[PDB]
Amino acid sequence: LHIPVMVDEVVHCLSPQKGQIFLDMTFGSGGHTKAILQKESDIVLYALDRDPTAYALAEHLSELYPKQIRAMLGQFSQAEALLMKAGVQPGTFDGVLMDLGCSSMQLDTPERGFSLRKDGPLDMRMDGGRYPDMPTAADVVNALDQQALASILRTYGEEKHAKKIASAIVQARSIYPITRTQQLASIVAGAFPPSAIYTRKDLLQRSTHIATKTFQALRIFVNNELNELYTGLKTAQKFLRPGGRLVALSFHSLEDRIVKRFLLGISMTRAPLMWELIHKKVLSPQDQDVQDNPRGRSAKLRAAIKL
Amino acid sequence: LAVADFGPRDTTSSSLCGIDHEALNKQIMEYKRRKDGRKRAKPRLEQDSSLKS
RNA sequence: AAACUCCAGUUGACACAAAAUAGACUACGAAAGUGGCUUUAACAUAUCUGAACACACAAUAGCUAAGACCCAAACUGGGAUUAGAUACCCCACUAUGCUUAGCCCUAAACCUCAACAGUUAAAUCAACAAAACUGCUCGCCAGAACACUACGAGCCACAGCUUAAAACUCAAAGGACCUGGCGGUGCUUCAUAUCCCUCUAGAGGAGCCUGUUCUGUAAUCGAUAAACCCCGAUCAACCUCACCACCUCUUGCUCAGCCUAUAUACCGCCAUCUUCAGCAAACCCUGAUGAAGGCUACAAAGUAAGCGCAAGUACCCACGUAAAGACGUUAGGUCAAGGUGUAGCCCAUGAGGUGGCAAGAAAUGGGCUACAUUUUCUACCCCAGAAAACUACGAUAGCCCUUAUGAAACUUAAGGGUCGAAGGUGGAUUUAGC
Ligand SMILES: Nc1ncnc2c1ncn2[C@@H]1O[C@H](CSCC[C@H](N)C(=O)O)[C@@H](O)[C@H]1O
Ligand SMILES: [K+]
Ligand SMILES: [K+]
Ligand SMILES: [K+]
Ligand SMILES: [K+]
Ligand SMILES: [K+]
Ligand SMILES: [K+]
Ligand SMILES: [K+]
Ligand SMILES: [K+]
Ligand SMILES: [Mg+2]
Ligand SMILES: [Mg+2]
Ligand SMILES: [Mg+2]
Ligand SMILES: [Mg+2]
Ligand SMILES: [Mg+2]
Ligand SMILES: [Mg+2]
Ligand SMILES: [Mg+2]
Ligand SMILES: [Mg+2]
Ligand SMILES: [Mg+2]
Ligand SMILES: [Mg+2]
Ligand SMILES: [Mg+2]
Ligand SMILES: [Mg+2]
Ligand SMILES: [Mg+2]
Ligand SMILES: [Mg+2]
Ligand SMILES: [Mg+2]
Ligand SMILES: [Mg+2]
Ligand SMILES: [Mg+2]
Ligand SMILES: [Mg+2]
Ligand SMILES: [Mg+2]
Ligand SMILES: [Mg+2]
Ligand SMILES: [Mg+2]
Ligand SMILES: [Mg+2]
Ligand SMILES: [Mg+2]
Ligand SMILES: [Mg+2]
Ligand SMILES: [Mg+2]
Ligand SMILES: [Mg+2]
Ligand SMILES: [Mg+2]
Ligand SMILES: [Mg+2]
Ligand SMILES: [Mg+2]
Ligand SMILES: [Mg+2]
Incomplete structure (x- = not known):
């Protein structure tokens, strides 16, 4: 089981109260969405996922709460149009909980x-066939040239x-198609000597697969x-x-950079900040909680209020 | 400045990401459309035959 | 940014903290150390040398106990920074720095110069440092690393100090200097279409032309950062042709042949700095005859042939533009211009014939034509009339037809008809011109 990461902080941070409408741009499993519909029984909530x-x-x-939760499907970019069809263009959403990651x-x-x-x-x-033409990771690796393919790993994966x-x-792709996850892991792990398969360690000094990033x-x-x-x-x-009150959760510093600067109005690469x-604190979950849920160790919570 | 006359007084986030995600997304989509060292001797030790000649 | 707002400014009261100026002085003490004032005590030795351990000392840090606490400050917390920042930067505060009484006994405790005595004549002297030595004595050393380590022993030391090996391992380790390279290296002067700004027209967006990449194909090759990319080609429908498929020939157009490998064997012809001004034989001299170095014009060791620049010549001048531009750098480019060393093939890696490939899912370089009113069309070649937004501007593209060339033309070129698209003057960036 996976406990919602930093659920206690996100609930306190947003302080859901009666008469307030909230949005959730990443419903996913719904652990956070359900923790928010428990504190306030009169809350109004909107959900979204890819x-x-x-x-x-x-x-x-939604059966558990007929109208307190409203489910929506789509990407972040398509969210405005989807919600615009509802007609809440101003929105007046008290808080938007933009949980991130997988x-x-x-x-x-x-599967x-x-x-x-x-x-x-x-x-x-993340798409579940809603767009059956959306390229998958197998397609990306078999199509892009070394120069192009390197860029994805170098930046998104921090691959030195x-x-x-x-x-x-x-x-590898020339010899045979790359269609399975283990095949990719072996292909990436082969790049380095046999020792290097698990030499790399996690931020907690715990060995991880070399192809994890x-x-x-x-x-x-x-x-x-x-x-x-x-x-x-x-x-x-x-x-x-x-x-x-906006509340984001950047599992990795990479996505946290966009959240870090957006809230501070800093250039991603003057008018007053709003x-x-x-x-402000960007901190991992309690160390006691990190061991329980290592997946969420790097969760950096950035909260802000619109101005 | 004092002498001067001032007159009557009153586009892709891919670049920010660092990679052209759109162009690459098309490239893979286009592919999908078709789918569906040596030793160096020390210079001082280099051998000569001038004396033998 | 956090932090404080019992905060800040003026005036007065105020310490068990630290001691501007003097001090540009170079003193005192065994060293460690000693720099506000005063007083008291007080700075061994009428030969010299003499200890890891004896004797007595010994910065900073640290330990034990009790105090002081302005300020600074490990750690810690907080605020930034960053891919990460348990750092550098900012704030707060503690051990601690201080006093007292005990310990601990370590420093790049270093003038990196042992004490004492003597000399300035020899040879001045590996180098650098700090001129070179002599007498005498104590301590110490004997390739590197292992190793400020292990064990033993002593110690108020208990994560400590002093003394201090061996095994395995290596052919070096090391000192000083010189050159080159490099420096998120200093200073000064510079770049003239030139590094930045300034000036003009462009590229980067659109369509088309063309090269390249990638993909595709049974189906060349080479160039490929500046210094490749309308490049070898002042040029590929056959031919060219070197490629692919099939068939065919074997003393073969040649006293054979090979566009087979190697441009990292080369000649030849070139790129590049060069939008440079230097290269350099033969001598001479300095450094003790070391690697190295060789200029001063009121001149102090350089002289220098030759090559380059220059001069001269070409074009319309003595101007400008060409041309020229050494040595050397990038084993730069080219064995596919031709030639050729080496290696390889010889019923095939050679020769001939027939047909065929060379596309675009895309990306990108260069160019063309545009987006219009300084424009569009016509007359004219500058005193004109019309056009001027969905019948405008705009394709040199698409499609259809004719013609030219050829044996061969959906293909190549020209012309006509039809068609009337993107484009509305182009972000970061970037090119050229005196
Ligand atoms: N661009 C996007 N638009 C919408 N949903 C997205 C998204 N990127 C990721 N997601 C989804 O957001 C979720 C983030 S991880 C899951 C978090 C969720 N709160 C939970 O119940 O655990 C995933 O379901 C993921 O598929
Ligand atoms: K003083
Ligand atoms: K010293
Ligand atoms: K140097
Ligand atoms: K342009
Ligand atoms: K050559
Ligand atoms: K040749
Ligand atoms: K040859
Ligand atoms: K162009
Ligand atoms: Mg004595
Ligand atoms: Mg002694
Ligand atoms: Mg002794
Ligand atoms: Mg000692
Ligand atoms: Mg001491
Ligand atoms: Mg002390
Ligand atoms: Mg303080
Ligand atoms: Mg204190
Ligand atoms: Mg000292
Ligand atoms: Mg002595
Ligand atoms: Mg030794
Ligand atoms: Mg020590
Ligand atoms: Mg020891
Ligand atoms: Mg011992
Ligand atoms: Mg263009
Ligand atoms: Mg090549
Ligand atoms: Mg080559
Ligand atoms: Mg090159
Ligand atoms: Mg033919
Ligand atoms: Mg042909
Ligand atoms: Mg041949
Ligand atoms: Mg060469
Ligand atoms: Mg002239
Ligand atoms: Mg010239
Ligand atoms: Mg000349
Ligand atoms: Mg070469
Ligand atoms: Mg043949
Ligand atoms: Mg036409
Ligand atoms: Mg004809
Ligand atoms: Mg028209």
């Missing part, structure tokens, strides 16, 4: 292709040896999480009420 499986959960979970269910189900450890089709796509892990993929890189480029994060935050601001950081 995964139709996640949108079905919300629809099934869902626990998405990466716990091997979805997110887990390198298990064997599934190399999808790595971009040229080395990219050449191996180009050679490579999968994150392909995950970010298939789902364009970074560019979609900029539009999603911008859309939230337009639909966010004045005096309304945000109030009630909870």
